[PDB]
Design a protein around this nucleic acid. Sequence first.
DNA 1: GCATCCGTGAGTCGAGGAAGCACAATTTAACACTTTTGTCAAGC
Length: 48
Amino acid sequence: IPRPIKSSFREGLTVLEYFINTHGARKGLADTALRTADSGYLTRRLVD
DNA sequence: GCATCCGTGAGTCGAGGAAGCACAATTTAACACTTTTGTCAAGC
């Protein structure tokens, strides 16, 4: 997104900046749940 | 011979909550009666 987050967590984020921040924050948290699942499947194939 | 489609797989522990009758055949209980067993008392 070209529009950055000009504010800092010290200065506080505007209402709008928070909405666009959750876009990437939640997508990365959903990636965490997926990567652990595929890595476990990969590990079982390596072991066997 | 080629591609569409079926088959298989996608983390680990936890924790918790919802029709009706008749009639023959048969097994089950129910009873009268005999044997088998646990018993009390008296005497050898």
